[PDB]
Structure 1
């Protein structure tokens, strides 16, 4: 679809078999989700945001569906204030900005 920006660009995602709400975030390199259980192995990693750096769990090659578009990529799990879909997955679903 075409998504205007007068409201937050929230979408329903499917991951680990559960539905969630997440923000399409072109200012995020990476996809970061609030604390949750995910199957598979993970490695500890750090990521930085506007306020500093946090510890996250890095899950690689995770299946995630975003508005019915499929992506398979890295999902970071940790104390983000909001579930965000970053460019690593936005590129997989063909997302561009246009003006």
Structure 2
């Protein structure tokens, strides 16, 4: 689909058997999700934002269904205020910016 921007661009995602709502974010180089129940071996990382830098756990090869479309990649779990779908998975679902 085509999404206009009068409202935040939120989509329903399925990850780890759980259902969440997440923001399509062209300004995020990576994907970061609120703290959640995920299996496996993860590793520290820190990513910067507007209000400062935050501490996160990187999980690789994580399957995500975004707007019921499949993608496999790296997901970061941490204290973000919102679930964010970043460019690393937007390219995989073939998403483009158009004006």
Q: What TM-score bracket applies, with the shorter chain setting the length?
A: over 0.9
SS of 1:75's equivalent? strand
Give a deviation string over 1:61-96, Cα, whole Å, max 9, x none. 100000111110000000101000000000000000
- Give, in whole Å, the separation in 2 of the partners of 1:21 and 1:41: 24
Unaligned runs of 5+ in 2: none
- Give, in whole Å, the separation in 1 of the partners of 2:37 and 2:28: 22
Give a deviation string over 1:37-81, Cα, whole Å, max 9, x none. 101110111111111111101000100000111110000000101
What's the TM-score once normalised by structure 1's chain length? 0.98
SS of 2:20's equivalent? strand
**Structure 1 residue 97: deviation in Å?**
0.3
* Aligned residue in 2 for 1:83: 83
| C-alpha RMSD over aligned residues | 0.5
Unaligned runs of 5+ in 1: none
What's the TM-score once normalised by structure 2's chain length? 0.98
Q: Which runs of structure 1 show a deviation greater than 6 angstroms over 4 or more consecutive aligned residues? A: none
